[PDB]
DNA sequence: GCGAAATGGGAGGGTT
DNA sequence: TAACCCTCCCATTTCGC
């Protein structure tokens, strides 16, 4: 684990340094303020600076849905709100909440 | 209402 | 070069009861 990042910001009182000179493109955008990546859906109009931010939030109004929980088939849009749902059961039939396995498990969705 | 859990966004990291 | 996906932090919202 290195901490050598020879990308350094020029903007003027910004100390932002980078290992990689994509990751500091990447925050030029935070000084200029630009988000050209719009949400067109519905009563939405949000923006983000970055396509991929874009990307993931359209998945709240597409409902795609990846990633799957093993134990309880849970669908998740992202892969890190699926690694903090699996938490859920290793403190604690039907893996869900309230409930007592494939199909009772699918037909939850 | 309470705590837990889910949700959504920023920021940064890697892989092509 | 940058699209693309992952990982962590954080505040807000929703759920389970
Ligand atoms: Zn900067
Ligand atoms: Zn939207
Ligand atoms: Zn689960
Ligand atoms: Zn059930």
Same mark, same amino acid.
Request: a positive charge; glycine letters at 4%.
């Given at each position: 684990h290195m901490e050598? +990042?020879?990308?350094?910001?020029?903007?003027?009182?910004?100390?932002?340094?980078?290992?990689?000179?994509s990751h500091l493109q990447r *925050?030029?955008?935070? *000084?200029?303020?630009?988000?050209?990546? #719009?949400?067109d859906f519905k &009563?939405?109009? @949000?923006?983000?600076? +970055?396509? &991929? #931010?874009?990307? @993931? *939030? #359209?998945?709240? *109004?597409?409902?795609?849905?990846?990633? #799957?929980?093993k134990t309880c088939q849970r669908k998740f849009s992202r892969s890190d709100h699926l690694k903090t749902h699996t938490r859920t059961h290793t403190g604690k039939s039907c893996r869900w909440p309230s409930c007592q396995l494939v199909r009772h498990h699918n037909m939850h969705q």
């Amino acid at each position: 684990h290195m901490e050598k +990042r020879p990308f350094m910001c020029a903007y003027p009182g910004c100390n932002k340094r980078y290992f990689k000179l994509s990751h500091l493109q990447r *925050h030029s955008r935070k *000084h200029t303020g630009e988000k050209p990546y #719009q949400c067109d859906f519905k &009563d939405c109009e @949000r923006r983000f600076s +970055r396509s &991929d #931010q874009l990307k @993931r *939030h #359209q998945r709240r *109004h597409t409902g795609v849905k990846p990633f #799957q929980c093993k134990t309880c088939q849970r669908k998740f849009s992202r892969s890190d709100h699926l690694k903090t749902h699996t938490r859920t059961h290793t403190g604690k039939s039907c893996r869900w909440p309230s409930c007592q396995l494939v199909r009772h498990h699918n037909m939850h969705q």
